Design a protein around this ligand. Structure first.
Ligand SMILES: *SCCNC(=O)CCNC(=O)[C@H](O)C(C)(C)COP(=O)(O)OP(=O)(O)OC[C@H]1O[C@@H](n2cnc3c(N)ncnc32)[C@H](O)[C@@H]1OP(=O)(O)O
Ligand SMILES: CC(C)(COP(=O)(O)OP(=O)(O)OC[C@H]1O[C@@H](n2cnc3c(N)ncnc32)[C@H](O)[C@@H]1OP(=O)(O)O)[C@@H](O)C(=O)NCCC(=O)NCCS
Ligand code: NA
Lengths: 427, 427
């Protein structure tokens, strides 16, 4: 009834990349058992807490639909428990440092012996065989390693990190693809596989469009849709001109269109005192007559200086500046509604406050109120894929070690050894 | 064997989001038949060509491992051929405008009648049921609708788009999760499902950390790790010091950590003339003693105001300026190796130039040289998930209608029928 009903996940993950992956599997029906360090558990529990003595929203928004067991895996009893759990699992997921799981004694080769059907899934900073394969990597370092930082921001400013989790959550979603692919092939082979996603590679996959641009730049010496292609438009900090004459690596293009048709971020009424009073406005090559009507420039329709992409290259930023003057007395929603009349791709910069309280996102189950009696209810992002046959049933994140005894019971342990394990500080 | 060997994909997709999904399915073994507009095909073919009358890099980097057939789907004969192809398909994938495929007559209800096993997968701008469900959306419009633009860039600048394809390829990768999930459940039910991913929702999934911050902000009135919470560091337009006093929605934090571990983008030697001569340096709380050794100031090791997150919060950007002075005479790789010996989370900003020609990325199959005997070789991004059991075999992108007659012969049509369809301008 749900895609992953019956799929048993032995979940070693912590922080963001790994837990995002296993949470989303949980949302699609998977039985997720989260292994955590004794006493402290996943480090997100105590990071950026809003209330003293309560698991942070960092933890709760990444660990819904999971059960928690505490386990010291560097004890002989802990390793024995892992062997029993591995034999019951369909998928093992981890995002420890390079070699950490191996050093515990659970190499891929040994895992295969324990369970020929289990899939091992890993998130690492760099791919196996990479010069940097042994490095520990965090979110923004991964954005920097994968080309995003270099190609994000403005030509007269620094490399800029994205607010979106390009390093972590993005890598987790990519690992989910790997895991599901390994499940699909297991129906044929009856055998599990090892799958791994490097954070650098997940970032680079989303920056594919910039590898397109790098080759175009190498081949032709110019990127015509970039602001720097407009003569005497772009300048560095010290006032030096920036043209493609002297550019050999894909530059920062500010708010240019990327993989979309040419566009820009345009101010709307209240921009001086409202950080998000903007729209993104696209000048699509097949929409020039429509734009000319909207901005009352009929004389631009039949002028070759204006009516082709090629003609607009020397003046596109002038055109954006002029269009922007038309929005001076309208808010971003009024502008979006106006542009929509013309079928022009255009929308508001939604603030996080607006998104958190948007009726539409709650209607469609993308922003979800999680019922949590212990911590008070909270919002989370639900499943971004909608299915005809089912809806996720999101349930609160576990307290540390909440399901330890419950899980140990399922392994067949009678009450005697459970006391021992607690006594020995194994769980 | 590859995970999706034998999976037949009827591929209606165009531009970036849809084609990224079906290409990556192709990389994992799927049989992808791309349906294209007669004459012009997928709009990416003519989109920023580097050579006249040769398919662009936009096209080739998103359409490897596919066959191409031209089809006028508004003709009765075209619709007939689609019905035949649907009956042989496991997955249909589309990213036309809202209602477009329905208007062609291929509603989900009708598709189910044709083939109870087929999965229908769609990329949309906004989710079904959303107030904005009927809008057409490109890359950066989705970045703006999903909260990324509002929370990316600087406090004294505009909302800023990511160079990463948060709207397009990211939505495509999310759709791949949905499709694979639908294949999993089909093993149980014997029935296909409809799956859809909205570009807004794919963006919001990656911006989950900012929805965390919005709730923290609403609950507490402050985000202590953001630059706006540091005494007299960030300043507004009129030049006065920023604070959370009047901030009610998650602001832009420049190059801050985005998570529990603070960081910043620090200049290295050559930054004045090299836009990517930077490293990201993360001041992890647990790694502080290691940082004190590299900085060569043991005074702060035992100082209480310094060896704690609370001790640094008043003067965090002061010590980022000082650590940056250590790097003024060293390039980003020299600075990174200096920090690698301490296991410190520090990494360089990699340029697209460096990444395109990096030995490691080519060694691990993440940057791949495609052997294209028609157009000349090009680079692409390969599969970002690495598997123990197989490697992708990437094959060059198809010419427009290159496999039309080949596909029609597979449908059991003879040369008479084929010539009729060509003459009638159906293919
Ligand atoms: S989303 C952004 C985070 N990035 C990643 O997910 C990338 C992969 N993960 C990592 O690079 C690291 O895990 C990061 C996130 C950088 C954290 O680094 P740490 O310094 O915390 O190193 P480890 O995570 O590898 O953990 C250190 C040692 O602790 C052992 N360990 C973990 N949990 C347990 C339990 N429950 N019981 C006993 N030991 C445990 C690890 O196995 C590891 O062992 P070593 O062999 O000593 O490294
Ligand atoms: C990208 C997008 C904005 C482009 O819009 P567009 O250029 O107007 O193209 P559309 O997809 O709307 O298609 C236009 C029409 O041509 C038709 N068409 C497309 N291919 C055809 C073919 N081979 N034969 C006959 N008709 C065809 C469509 O069915 C549609 O018909 P309609 O008049 O009933 O609406 C739009 O496809 C879209 O909003 N896609 C969904 C979101 C998305 O994926 N965006 C792109 C991210 S990379
Ligand atoms: Na008008």
């Amino acid at each position: 009834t749900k895609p992953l009903d019956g799929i048993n996940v032995l979940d070693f993950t912590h922080v963001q990349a790994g837990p995002a992956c296993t949470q989303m599997m949980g949302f699609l029906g998977a039985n997720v058992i989260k292994i955590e360090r004794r006493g402290s558990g996943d480090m997100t529990r105590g990071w950026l807490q809003d209330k003293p003595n309560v698991d942070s929203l960092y933890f709760t928004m990444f660990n819904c639909n999971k059960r928690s067991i505490e386990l010291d895996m560097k004890t002989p009893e802990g390793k024995e428990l892992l062997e029993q759990m591995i034999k019951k699992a369909d998928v093992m997921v981890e995002n420890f440092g390079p070699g950490a799981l191996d050093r515990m004694g659970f190499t891929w080769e040994y895992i295969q012996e324990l369970n020929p059907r289990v899939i091992l899934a890993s998130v690492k900073g760099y791919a196996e065989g990479h010069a940097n394969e042994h490095l520990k990597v965090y979110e923004n370092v991964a954005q920097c390693s994968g080309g995003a930082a270099a190609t994000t921001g403005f030509w007269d400013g620094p490399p800029t990190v994205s607010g979106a989790a390009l390093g972590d959550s993005n890598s987790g979603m990519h690992l989910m693809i790997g895991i599901l692919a390994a499940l699909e092939i297991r129906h044929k082979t009856g055998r599990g596989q090892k799958v791994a996603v490097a954070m650098q590679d997940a970032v680079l996959n989303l920056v594919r469009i910039k590898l397109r641009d790098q080759q175009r730049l190498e081949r032709t010496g110019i990127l015509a849709e970039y602001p720097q292609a407009q003569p005497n438009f772009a300048f560095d900090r010290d006032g030096n001109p920036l043209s493609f004459d002297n550019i050999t690596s894909v530059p920062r293009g500010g708010n240019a269109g990327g993989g979309g048709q040419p566009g820009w971020m345009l101010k709307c009424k209240g921009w001086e005192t409202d950080a998000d009073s903007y729209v993104y406005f696209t000048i699509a090559a097949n929409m020039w007559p429509q734009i000319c009507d909207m901005i009352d420039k009929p004389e631009w329709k039949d002028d070759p200086a204006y009516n082709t992409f090629e003609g607009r290259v020397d003046k596109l930023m002038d055109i954006f500046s002029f269009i922007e003057t038309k929005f001076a007395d309208k808010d971003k929603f009024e502008v979006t509604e106006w542009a929509a009349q013309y079928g022009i791709p255009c929308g508001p910069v939604m603030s996080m406050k607006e998104l958190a309280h948007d009726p539409s996102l709650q209607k469609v189950g993308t922003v979800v109120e999680v019922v949590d009696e212990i911590r008070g209810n909270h919002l989370t992002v639900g499943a971004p894929f909608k299915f005809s046959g089912f809806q996720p049933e999101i349930t609160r994140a576990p307290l540390l070690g909440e399901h330890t005894d419950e899980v140990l019971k399922e392994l067949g342990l009678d009450d005697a050894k459970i006391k021992e394990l607690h006594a020995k500080q194994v769980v």
